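User: Structure with adenosine-5'-diphosphate, tokens only please.
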Amino acid sequence: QWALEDFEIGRPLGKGKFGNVYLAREKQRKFILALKVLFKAQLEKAGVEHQLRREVEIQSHLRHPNILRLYGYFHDATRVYLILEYAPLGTVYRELQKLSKFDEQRTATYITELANALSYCHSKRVIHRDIKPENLLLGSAGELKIADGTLDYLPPEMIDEKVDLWSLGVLCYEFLVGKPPFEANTYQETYKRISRVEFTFPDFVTEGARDLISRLLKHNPSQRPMLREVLEHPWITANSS
Ligand SMILES: Nc1ncnc2c1ncn2[C@@H]1O[C@H](COP(=O)(O)OP(=O)(O)O)[C@@H](O)[C@H]1O
Ligand SMILES: Nc1ncnc2c1ncn2[C@@H]1O[C@H](COP(=O)(O)OP(=O)(O)O)[C@@H](O)[C@H]1O
Ligand SMILES: Nc1ncnc2c1ncn2[C@@H]1O[C@H](COP(=O)(O)OP(=O)(O)O)[C@@H](O)[C@H]1O
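Assistant:
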């Protein structure tokens, strides 16, 4: 029976495409959470109010340490309110900006956590479209949380479960190098690069990391690893917390 007056609103955690995210405490049970406020005008505009109900339904029923929890939601005439797990350390994206690249241990760890979340998702017949750093939040103890321009993160085949592994390979590269592997001056250039799987490695990328990324960034989906092969990859196990 949720309503706005059920919450004490605190400082804005960030602005999104369709509204603001606020720190908020539930007066009743005194839960801490992130109150995400979406404007229906702006959702109807972008034509996203459809996909929103869907995405909300699915995300309600995921329970996993590395997937951001959606506790509830509600609305009024003008806006939709999403009651979200509060992630106190911000986005992986902004952490990539603060730091410039991630070290191997940090990178291996995120990928591990990412692969578990996706393994869990696959076990529920749920598939992501793209996992970008902006879509990843960090928990109180630095744990990764999937929250869910865009070109950069799309597989050649979108331009099957196997999409989520191209995603891992894009992220793994971005984490280590500081830029996405297919980054180019225009849309058309980026389209070609992704389409032909054209990436190169800077010298500091070690042999193990190159091997994993290369296995993940395979143009043809059937040749991409199983999530389990990622988890057990020698470079992963060598560097993951
Ligand atoms: N659960 C959360 N915990 C902490 N901060 C959040 C949470 N959700 C969103 N934010 C903050 O709000 C910012 C933008 O919100 P969001 O609406 O998710 O962006 P978009 O809709 O553009 O993907 C994020 O960069 C993040 O800092
Ligand atoms: N940290 C939290 N902040 C806000 N709401 C929460 C929090 N933890 C749980 N809830 C709320 O409590 C309800 C159920 O409690 P929860 O522990 O998430 O479920 P369960 O006990 O079944 O695992 C949810 O509908 C959600 O709204
Ligand atoms: N009363 C409160 N007001 C504002 N923020 C709070 C409050 N209580 C806890 N927090 C913050 O919410 C986050 C999660 O709280 P909690 O789960 O108790 O911390 P942790 O998970 O680190 O033990 C932490 O960043 C914490 O500092």
